[PDB]
Amino acid sequence: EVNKIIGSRTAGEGAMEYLIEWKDGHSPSWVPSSYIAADVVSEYETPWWTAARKADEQALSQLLEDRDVDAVDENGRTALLFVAGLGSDKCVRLLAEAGADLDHRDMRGGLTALHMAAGYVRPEVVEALVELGADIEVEDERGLTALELAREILKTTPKGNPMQFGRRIGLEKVINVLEGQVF
Ligand SMILES: [Mg+2]
Numbered sequence: 001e002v003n004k005i006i007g008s009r010t011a012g013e014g015a016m017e018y019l020i021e022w023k024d025g026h027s028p029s030w031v032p033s034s035y036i037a038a039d040v041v042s043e044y045e046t047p048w049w050t051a052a053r054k055a056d057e058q059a060l061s062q063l064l065e066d067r068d069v070d071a072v073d074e075n076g077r078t079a080l081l082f083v084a085g086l087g088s089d090k091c092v093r094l095l096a097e098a099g100a101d102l103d104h105r106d107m108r109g110g111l112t113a114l115h116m117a118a119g120y121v122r123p124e125v126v127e128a129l130v131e132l133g134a135d136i137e138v139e140d141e142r143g144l145t146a147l148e149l150a151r152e153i154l155k156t157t158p159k160g161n162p163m164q165f166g167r168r169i170g171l172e173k174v175i176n177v178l179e180g181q182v183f
Contacts, residue, residue, distance in 0.1 A: 002036050005044040008067045014076060014107075016068075018044065045071065052079035055088035060095065069098040076107030085116035089128045102134040110141035118146040119153060123173040136178055147178035 006028055007019030016033045018041065033041050048071055051059035060079065070078050080100045083091035092113070096102060105112055114134050117125035126146070130136060139145055144152070154171040158164055176183070 002040055005040065006066065008044070008071055010068050010070050010072065014072060016041075016071060045073075048079065049073065049082075052082040052091075053086075055083050055086050055091045057088075057090050057094055060091060064098050069095055069100045070104065076105070078104050078113075080104065080113045081106060081111070081116050084113035084122065084125050084129065085120045087117075087120065087122040087125055089122075089124045092125055092128050093132070096128075096132040102129060102132060103138050105138065105140070110139070112138050112140075112146065114138070114146040115140055115144075115149055118150040118174050118178070121153075121167060121170040121174065123170055123177060126174050126177045130177060145178075147175065150174045150178065 001023045003021040003023045005018045006021050009017050009019070009030065011017045011032070017030045018033060018036065019028050019030055020036065021028050047059070048063055048067060050056075051063060070080075072078055078100065080092065080095045080102070081104070083095065102114075103112055111119075112134070114126065114129050114136060116122075117129060136147065137145055140149070150171055154168060154175065157168050157171065159168065
């Protein structure tokens with residue numbers, strides 16, 4: 001008896017709830033995602049995930065009016081993780097300013113936005129997350145901080161062509177930022 005979904009929120013640990021405009025006229029109220037049709041939920045969430053994967057700052061800003069900054073997908077990713085991995089410091093800052101949990105861990109290894117930024121070699125995003133107050137000591141399921149992950153990826157990166165050489169330079173910048181080195 002859903003007319004439309006008119007809002008989203010996180011609940012508890014890792015759950016989503018939706019604000020429902022009811023067909024029969026009862027005042028809108030919050031229900032767990034499981035109480036209503038999967039297709040109506042999926043169709044409501046789509047523009048959010050599209051905006052995050054496009055690092056579309058304008059669309060994220062508009063959608064935030066009614067939706068939770070920390071909406072999670074099936075794998076426990078929030079928009080912050082998607083835009084951090086893509087290297088969008090503009091969208092990282094937008095979402096942080098909107099109240100995103102900077103320390104959110106996913107369910108595909110327990111990675112944070114800082115692990116995504118370190119692993120995809122996004123030094124400006126690592127800088128931004130540190131500035132904005134991410135807890136750099138948060139560990140993934142393997143017990144690795146973002147700094148330890150960056151060092152691991154550096155050790156597995158060969159030195160053989162100019163693109164690989166450049167990747168190593170970016171990883172070294174990630175490492176220097178997380179170590180708190182003087183620039
Ligand atoms: Mg350690």
